[PDB]
């Protein structure tokens, strides 16, 4: 998620976004362990989304 | 900025395929180019039984050095040197012989 549209949200709305991204990352690890993960690039893509949200969330102060 | 770019009409100077013309399909590191239809080689690959195979003999194109080609001037039909012209708001590439832009 681009950071330009993240700074339009709120701390109440940013925490729901971060919580949802952690749910998706957990499911991606379930597929990787069992073996039904073709979209291998999605693993590193959700890591940077979580880091991006935490960067903007710290800037909220 | 680089003088030789992808999908450019070029002519080979110096080498076994000197005089031929083609298009740049790939630009490598260490200053090498893959030009379509020049410098053809055949690679013989053993069809090992590990996870299928590839084939027998395949013919592809070997890379050649970036200083062994030149932009082809499609107004005089000759190899040409290229420079960068004064920029109001953007660079372009021009022919050193005729000062017209490279297209």
């Amino acid at each position: 998620m681009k950071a330009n549209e993240l700074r339009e949200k709120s701390v109440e709305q940013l925490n729901e976004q971060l919580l949802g991204l952690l749910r998706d990352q957990f499911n991606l690890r379930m597929q990787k362990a069992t073996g039904q993960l073709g979209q291998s690039h999605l693993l590193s893509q959700v890591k940077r989304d979580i880091a991006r949200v935490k960067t903007v969330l710290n800037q909220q102060a | 900025m680089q003088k030789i770019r992808r999908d450019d009409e070029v002519i080979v100077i110096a080498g076994k395929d000197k005089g031929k013309r083609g298009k740049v399909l790939k630009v490598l590191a260490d200053d090498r180019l893959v030009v379509g239809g020049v410098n053809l080689i055949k690679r013989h690959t053993k069809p090992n039984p590990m996870l299928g195979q590839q084939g027998g003999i395949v013919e592809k194109e070997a890379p050649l050095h970036v200083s062994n080609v030149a932009i082809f001037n499609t107004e005089t039909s000759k190899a040409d040197r290229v420079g960068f012209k004064v920029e109001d708001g953007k660079k372009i590439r021009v022919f050193k012989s005729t000062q017209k832009p490279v297209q």
């Binding site: 952690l22 749910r23 990352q25 690890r29 990787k32 362990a33 069992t34 | -």
Partner: protein, 94 residues
């Protein structure tokens, strides 16, 4: 536990011949878990994420195997393993 630790304790199911037989004859499941996870967090995460009732959790630490190469002697990461027992009749699915 805080809302963020729930999604980070489990790492995925552990599949093998031993793990397969347990999942049928004993309704007991083997998972890979974070090396700093405790039996209390594993119990809460499985109940929350799969909507089942766990009754007992047992854990063990696994040393990483050591492999010698030309450059020297390298070794793999240590990891942690969990056995999770559920209610008499209920199935766990992903």
């Amino acid at each position: 536990m805080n809302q963020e630790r729930v999604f980070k304790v489990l790492l995925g199911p552990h599949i093998s011949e031993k793990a397969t037989g347990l999942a049928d004859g004993k309704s007991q499941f083997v998972f890979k878990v974070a090396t700093d996870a405790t039996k209390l967090e594993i119990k809460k995460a499985v109940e929350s994420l799969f909507s089942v009732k766990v009754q007992r959790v047992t854990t063990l630490n696994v040393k990483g195997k050591t492999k010698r190469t030309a450059r020297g002697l390298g070794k793999r990461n240590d990891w942690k393993k969990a056995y999770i027992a559920l209610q008499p009749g209920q199935d766990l699915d992903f």
